[model samples]
Target: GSMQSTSNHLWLLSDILGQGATANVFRGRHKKTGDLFAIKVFNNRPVDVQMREFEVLKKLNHKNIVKLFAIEEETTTRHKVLIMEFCPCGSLYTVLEEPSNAYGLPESEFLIVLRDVVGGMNHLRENGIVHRNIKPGNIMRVIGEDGQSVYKLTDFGATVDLWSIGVTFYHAATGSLPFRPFEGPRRNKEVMYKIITGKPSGAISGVQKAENGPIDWSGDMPVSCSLSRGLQVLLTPVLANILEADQEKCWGFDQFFAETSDILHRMVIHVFSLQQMTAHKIYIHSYNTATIFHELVYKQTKIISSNQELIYEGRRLVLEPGRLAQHFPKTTEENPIFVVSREPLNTIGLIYEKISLPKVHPRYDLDGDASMAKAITGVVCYACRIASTLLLYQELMRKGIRWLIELIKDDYNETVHKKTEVVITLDFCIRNIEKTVKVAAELGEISDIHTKLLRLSSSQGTIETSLQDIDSRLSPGGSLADAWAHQEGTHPKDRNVEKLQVLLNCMTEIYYQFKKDKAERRLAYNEEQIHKFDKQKLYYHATKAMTHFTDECVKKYEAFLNKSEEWIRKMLHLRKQLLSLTNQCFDIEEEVSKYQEYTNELQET
Candidate 1:
């Protein structure tokens, strides 16, 4: 009855979002505004604790922190309820509980969680507040306005200091707590005592089979761990320092932020063994050959430097002082480098070629061969640069196209299709044109292919000019067609038709030319330019391979963009019919509501 009274008075509580020992979270909607919120109702929590949480949430305002909207009391029961932002995606703990994430979260998702939690904690620290309870369960995940999942810190009632943060990271990275008894009854005090007294070694505690089973203190990640090798290498030292039980030695937030930021910026390279059965992925700064070698050796054999050798494509990669680009110019996940031992048998087919260093006195000075080599290298570098630039443009274009589609979808749903009138407004046209210009500016960065991209600039100019023309034709009112249709003696129907045609053409051409130019360039690189490089040469092959992969991505995005364009065109063509149908449905719904009120009156009688 109190639940019903609460709904009637202010908020309508729906399904349970989460349940805890002291409180229960429910999905609630404001009766007046119909805005969704999370309502945390205290069932057994102390009044002081509840008030403290409310005050703390009210003062905190950060992108990565949950927002507290209002505090209310139930009408009849007088229970305190805290209204907060509803995180539809649930929490980091729920994500980790998925069967797919049994071992750990995928690297991309893990990074998101890491960055979000760190940011939220940094804000808390800046405000002189410590999140006493820092664990995956307390970190909520919400979808941001930009359609990206954002992890925010929540349920901060209480910390083992930064040590709990380490435990959270460990759990996120390995899907298991770094310090926990595997074999006891769920809440064993002895295990808790041991964990409290134990040294903070970065190793995971072993598992046990039964209640009284012997503890398997293997101190290694479980076999089911899905954490990538590169992440493992990066996190090893980070976990070791933060998870340290000794407060004095444990890493502070500053150190943690620095290390995590460093890892975020590094490039990940997966190196496979000769048999290709095992892989040792490592992260390094771009072109750092020595770090790559050291990481690879440490992960693969752990033998002292003298006995191990790194080989790739039948060539022994000497631990010489040189950048990785000098040896393997383009190392990627799809095209990984291979490693083999230095033993005679393992290095049987491996060639020991010495990479030539520049000298003051050159033997090939008189010969034209050196000049020819330089020319070829220059051309290869140019082609690779072009490919990389194109790859960037492709991503920018894809994002631009996605933003346009969302704009169009939102406009169509909110205005054109939902309303009775199917008029395209001047403001809508201006916004679309402005976005097109923005995309054109981004694509304009490729000056090297200026001649090839002429069509894009031309299309952009056309769209801008069309927008100006529509703006002038629009009367004081917003809608171009509606205003023109009312003007005297100017063939109202014809003018409206012409204006709609122009608007449609402008909208369609913006995406049409964009898609066309990208598709044309994608094909040209795939067929014409890339084949010119000599396949036999290492540099040429690497350049061609990388370009090929990037071009494939370009193709994929172009296809998606094409589909969205088609859908937009279809929606534009059917706008009037859709608006009419929607209006009819609304009218029918109004009639049904009228009848429902009458029925309610009869039932009351």
Candidate 2:
């Protein structure tokens, strides 16, 4: 009723946007200005906590923090509502979770958002307020309808902790959070352990144990194997310095802000500009693939015509002046039905050409078998890229591919009748692959060093190799040096201690890279969010053969492109023939009409 009671402001609440434990956020607008704001409705809260939050928010003023416009409280109904500035795009978690959202923030944008969050948190910390739930769900991205970046911090709580900021930063970088699934009663205990012990469920190193007294600076800090060698080396110190269970172990807001400025800049460079680094074997392989594809297939016609090409599949084809086509010469040599070579030149173009259809045809008909096949190929190729974007993170090539695929579907029409079959086939393939991608992304990383360690068996048979080592090392008196010291005078043939340390470091780096690669394979796809883009339990393609079919289809389309002009000319000639036939029929009809009138004799008078 307070929404109606206010004279200075009028709140027009729209649909509910998000639901929390204590509140439900609804889209609302100010009556006079028609400006959007988020209205959070909480039915009841402890009187003291409610009053505390109200007081804290009233005093808070920062560029990055959500600006509270008005608060309406009803004591009789015990309804509390806070109308705050609206963020159109939604939460950071929504961006990371949504599989269809193709637009991503660059490393620089990531830093900007992080700093914005830090600025607000620093202000809060200085004022003696801590955001207990400082996850992606609390950070808002103010995206315009056309997708602009405006990040702001929201959902502050009355608490004191800085460790949650580390979780936010890690989630923003990797797309997946560090901890395992946390829901229900049993899971909360596991999460609690991570919270107090400063170790995620599967963390290998870079964590502070409960027994660690006042921080031991002498020992080596564990680096995340999930990051690259260069990245891990840089990030090890930062994570060690910032992420800790003990309040005294972590950096204060001001100190963190100062330190992160330099760290983030170089991090951006490492992430965004890695391609400009010195060339390696992988680069050469990619170059060769592209070169072969271009020469053999893309420029095949030009090459053959210009005398730069010879026999393909044991047949020397010759070009004629009319619309250039391949002809097998009948010679004294045996002429067999030779198959086309299955090179990068043939297969790559098929996929590439289908993916290019949206650009090629503004109104492409999707009915005919040929047309349908083309459409299916396009969907499959785009789906593969989407999967890779989820898995391998193929950013450079398919930057606009997702938006373009949606554009093509938008351009299609079943009423056009020319390609009804084509549209249906394309739709089926796209939906299945999209579904498959969503499911795959939800699976996250398959294997990490922690998982790898758990799997490897030791001589004790049942106990895990890594677990045994960890137990022995963590034990009070047992140490790495002590093991070597015990082995010192035992036998004439003893392993070299210096060599063993070198070996262990190399193994750590090796496994670290494995974990890095394993982390790379992980993808985040929130199944609930997928429903926003695709709601139905429609068709799904899970056939092993479809992938091969896509490759073949790609080849078929490339050859079609080379002959497209000739096909157009043939169609035009057929149209002319039909027009001439129609004129003849009209002349016959005219003559028949004249004869009938003459025979009727009414015109004789």
Which candidate leads the pack in TM-score?
Answer: 1
Question: What are the per-residue Cα lDDT tens digits for candidate 2 across 1-605?
Answer: 33432333345343677778888787766667877778777765467777776776777788778888778753345477788888878888766543212122334455567668767777877787767778788888876455657668888642234556665666565443444333322445554464447553223123222332222122121221123333334444655566555555555656666766555543111111111111001101112332332233223222232322223223233333331112223221121111122111221111111222212232222222222233333333334432322212122112222222222223222112323333344335434444654575223432332233233212113322333443343344433112222222211132222222333333333323333433344323653233222211111221222343344333333343334333223323433443343343344334333432232113555
Worst 10 residues of 2 by lDDT: 274-283
Candidate 2 lDDT score at position 427: 39
Candidate 1 minimal-lDDT segment of 10 residues: 346-355
Off by over 4 Å in 2: 1-5, 8-14, 45-56, 73-80, 100-108, 144-148, 158-160, 181-233, 245-248, 251-254, 265-605
**Candidate 1 ranges with C-alpha deviation above 4 Å:** 1-14, 20-22, 43-56, 77-79, 144-148, 180-187, 195-203, 206-213, 274-276, 286-332, 335-605
Q: What do the candidate models score in CA lDDT, each in turn?
A: 0.53, 0.41
Give per-residue lDDT, candidate 2, residue 463: 21
In the range 152-178, model 1's lDDT, one tens digit per residue, is 888876126677787777778766666
How much is the lDDT of residue 439 in candidate 1? Answer: 75
For model 1 the TM-score comes to 0.47
Per-prediction TM-score, please?
0.47, 0.40
